[PDB]
Amino acid sequence: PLMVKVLDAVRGSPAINVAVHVFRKAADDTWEPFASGKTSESGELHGLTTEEEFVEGIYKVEIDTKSYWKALGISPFHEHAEVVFTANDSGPRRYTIAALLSPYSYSTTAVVTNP
Amino acid sequence: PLMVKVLDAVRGSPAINVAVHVFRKAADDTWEPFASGKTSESGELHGLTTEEEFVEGIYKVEIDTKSYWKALGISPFHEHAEVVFTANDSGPRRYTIAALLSPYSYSTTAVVTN
Amino acid sequence: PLMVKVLDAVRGSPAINVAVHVFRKAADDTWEPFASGKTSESGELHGLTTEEEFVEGIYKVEIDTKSYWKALGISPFHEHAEVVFTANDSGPRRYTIAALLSPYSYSTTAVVTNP
Amino acid sequence: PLMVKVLDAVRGSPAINVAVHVFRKAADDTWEPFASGKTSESGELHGLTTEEEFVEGIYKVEIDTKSYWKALGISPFHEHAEVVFTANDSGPRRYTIAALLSPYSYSTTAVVTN
Numbered sequence A, C: 001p002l003m004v005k006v007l008d009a010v011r012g013s014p015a016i017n018v019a020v021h022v023f024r025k026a027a028d029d030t031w032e033p034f035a036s037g038k039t040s041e042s043g044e045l046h047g048l049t050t051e052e053e054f055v056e057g058i059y060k061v062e063i064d065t066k067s068y069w070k071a072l073g074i075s076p077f078h079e080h081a082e083v084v085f086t087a088n089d090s091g092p093r094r095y096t097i098a099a100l101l102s103p104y105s106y107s108t109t110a111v112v113t114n115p
Numbered sequence B, D: 001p002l003m004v005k006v007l008d009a010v011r012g013s014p015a016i017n018v019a020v021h022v023f024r025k026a027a028d029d030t031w032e033p034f035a036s037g038k039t040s041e042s043g044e045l046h047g048l049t050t051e052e053e054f055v056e057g058i059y060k061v062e063i064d065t066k067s068y069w070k071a072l073g074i075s076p077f078h079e080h081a082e083v084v085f086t087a088n089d090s091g092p093r094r095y096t097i098a099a100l101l102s103p104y105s106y107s108t109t110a111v112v113t114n
């Protein structure tokens, strides 16, 4: 129900081995760790969570773009790219969070489908 | 030294009256308020800080996109748009952080010039 | 070897039933029709061409964004989105042309892989 | 009534000295040259046309992105970036066409204001 896809606009390729950390806002208003992983050779990260665990809430997907660019000899502008959204508040949905990265820019979108 | 510009991809216009909050990362790794404002009729926010105040450090610019779309009657995806970056004295002096907003997407870039 | 993917930034969904026309620059410098189709329920258009037919050249992928938005009651800004690129000039590659659409904006990227 | 602004997502700067050609769709459905220029040090191109000349019609703005990246020593994907749109008198009067360039991607938006 939660997938992350990352592309590299400089290379025209998937962004491989990009660390992703997901957090969920807790009752006390702090960000609790929720899931993490690294993107594959296709720039995809699957298997973060299950429909049982992915309850309603406010989630933050942090994509470690600085570590990515530094590993290729680019000193980038952003520390990371952060996507914050309410999920599942009208029931379960499937979310794809996609990001396109450049050293001084990024764009992100969400595709939200109803299984 | 720090300007923010916000544009609306649905209406093809500046994004007017958008709240923007800027934070600087503190010693204890929390985010301390630094500056804030609302974008003007041109979608710009100027006069956030001064050169003296804007020292090297990690800054977060939070744009209240959710309120913006709600005001237009449109249901958005994001709670806000975040832009987190290090200000470094070596690089050029003036930072423009621009954001292009759609309900389920945003794009941001930095223009860093002398 | 040539795939097109289209997303809608307003809805947070694939852009379905979007017409796509591909042209190849001919010897006389005119644009020759090459392939066409419509995106699926997943916002994807596969099966445009074959590795045999997709020779070196300059290609134009025209995405009929105006027809798309008009069909949803938006009067959009652009007539279409056009992506023009040299393909296969160092041998065969696989190309994904992706576009993210808003009424007054679009973004496009290419993912280019070597089979 | 028509301005173009081009930014570079790799360097975080305006895209300077970029050739821009503008065409208007003619009676016979071909593209006739209308205006052209090179972006300034701020990545902007002003003074393309006048209100009198810029009548309703279909216009194409072609940005020579390939030459821009080649000049920087970078191998790009696109031959150019194209933006094709109708100018309509009902809508606001001033059109800004902005483009954010990367080697394998570009984004464009229209800011249409009065």
Ligand SMILES: Oc1c(Br)cc(/C=C/c2c(Cl)cccc2Cl)cc1Br
Binding pocket: A005, A007, A096, A098, A099, A100, A107, A108, A109, C005, C007, C096, C097, C098, C099, C100, C107, C108, C109, C111
């Ligand atoms: O397989 C996919 C999936 Br799913 C999503 C995207 C989205 C790309 C995109 C973004 Cl994320 C931001 C701005 C512009 C763009 Cl064209 C691309 C591919 Br290729």
Ligand SMILES: Oc1c(Br)cc(/C=C/c2c(Cl)cccc2Cl)cc1Br
Binding pocket: B005, B007, B096, B098, B099, B100, B107, B108, B109, B111, D005, D007, D096, D098, D099, D100, D107, D108, D109, D111
């Ligand atoms: O006056 C300006 C300045 Br300064 C900067 C930008 C950048 C716009 C943009 C962004 Cl922010 C993300 C993705 C694509 C785009 Cl065309 C636009 C205008 Br109009």
